[PDB]
């Protein structure tokens, strides 16, 4: 059903994120892993983003979305929810859009392009298409590996989830 379709789609996108392969002297580019976008970067149609969207009832979530367009007339994006049950194309200010990484950082060659242990991030929560505040528990050891994170979770006495795995595609700065 929908849930299978969604989860599959999430994995496809995580798995297909290209590994940054530099040669000696190169530095990892903007949007490689944890390296942020350039100032006044504008994401391109088709690019995945974390988008801060307000429901009709006022509830704010960072959702997984795709850019449709950007208007320099208004400095607003249009973005679609990656979930087909999200039937609203959202008009969003730049500060409500965080571009997802366009390359995975290889821990074995460019570890400075990974988030450090205990850094605060927005991470996609397992089985959801939404991003939530979390601390880095462990960076990936190999190129194929996920981050381990502790989500802020007040259902726990210490305020944190157990370590949960999140792919590089889905961890961005908070």
């Amino acid at each position: 059903g929908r849930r299978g379709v969604l989860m599959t789609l999430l994995q496809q996108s995580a798995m297909t994120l290209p590994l940054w392969i530099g040669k000696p002297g190169d530095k990892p580019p903007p949007l490689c892993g944890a390296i942020p976008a350039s100032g006044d970067y504008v994401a391109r149609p088709g690019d995945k983003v974390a988008a801060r969207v307000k429901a009709v009832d006022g509830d704010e979530q960072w959702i997984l979305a795709e850019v449709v367009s950007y208007s320099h007339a208004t400095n607003k994006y249009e973005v679609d929810d990656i979930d087909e049950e999200g039937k609203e194309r959202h008009t969003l200010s730049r500060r409500r859009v965080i571009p997802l990484p366009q390359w995975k950082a290889n821990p074995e060659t460019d570890p400075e392009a990974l988030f450090q242990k205990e850094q605060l991030v927005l991470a996609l929560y397992p089985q959801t298409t939404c991003f939530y505040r979390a601390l880095i528990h462990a960076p990936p050891q190999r190129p194929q590996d996920d981050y381990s994170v502790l989500f802020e979770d007040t259902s726990y006495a210490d305020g944190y989830s157990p370590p949960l795995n999140v792919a590089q595609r889905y961890v961005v700065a908070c």
Binding site: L64, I82, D83, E85, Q127, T128, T129, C130, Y132
Partner: peptide
């Protein structure tokens, strides 16, 4: 979207 699917939320937590």
């Amino acid at each position: 979207a699917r939320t937590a």
